[PDB]
Amino acid sequence: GMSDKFLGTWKLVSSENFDDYMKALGVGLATRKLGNLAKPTVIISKKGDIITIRTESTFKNTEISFKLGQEFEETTADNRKTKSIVTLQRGSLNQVQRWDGKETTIKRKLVNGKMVAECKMKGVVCTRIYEKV
Ligand SMILES: CCCCCCCCCCCCCCCC(=O)O
């Protein structure tokens, strides 16, 4: 299953190309401004085979709980209603969100003890690096 090394609290320390990623998702200017200033904490926890990813920031909090390989209904930080799934690939925790015929992926992987989230939409690639805190 998911490596226990994902478990804990993570703080954003670097974000590359988030503005263009949000644009690809259809997020408007005023929301993007606040999104670009946000430095969220991401808390990853488990209970049995249910994994929870909680995001906390001044602007927006989100939480998803899921079992690997089992599609679920998600409400994203920008209030998209998606059909989502999370699965593993070579230890990477990989999320797909699907709505209105569109799709975006968020792949979270451990790299030298840091958590790297690669967010892709329509050719746009955003990389967000987290320190464990
Ligand atoms: C909670 C931070 C984002 C706040 C701004 C809302 C605009 C839409 C953001 C959608 C993508 C959320 C980031 C997922 C990738 C990650 O966990 O680093």
Swiss-Prot record:
(9Z)-octadecenoate binds at R108, R128, I129, Y130. Keywords: Acetylation, Charcot-Marie-Tooth disease, Cytoplasm, Disease variant, Disulfide bond, Lipid-binding, Neurodegeneration, Neuropathy, Transport. CDD domains: FABP8. It comes from the Eukaryota. Hexadecanoate binds at R108, R128, I129, Y130. Disulfide bonds join C119-C126. GO terms for molecular function: cholesterol binding; fatty acid binding. One of its GO terms (cellular component) is myelin sheath. Pfam families: Lipocalin. The modification N-acetylserine is found at S3. It is found in: Cytoplasm. GO terms for biological process: fatty acid transport; membrane organization. The keyword Transport applies. Monomer. Belongs to the calycin superfamily. Fatty-acid binding protein (FABP) family. May play a role in lipid transport protein in Schwann cells. May bind cholesterol. It is linked to Charcot-Marie-Tooth disease, demyelinating, type 1G: An autosomal dominant demyelinating form of Charcot-Marie-Tooth disease, a disorder of the peripheral nervous system, characterized by progressive weakness and atrophy, initially of the peroneal muscles and later of the distal muscles of the arms. Charcot-Marie-Tooth disease is classified in two main groups on the basis of electrophysiologic properties and histopathology: primary peripheral demyelinating neuropathies (designated CMT1 when they are dominantly inherited) and primary peripheral axonal neuropathies (CMT2). P2 protein and myelin basic protein together constitute a major fraction of peripheral nervous system myelin protein. Forms a beta-barrel structure that accommodates hydrophobic ligands in its interior. This is Myelin P2 protein. It comes from Homo sapiens. The gene is PMP2.
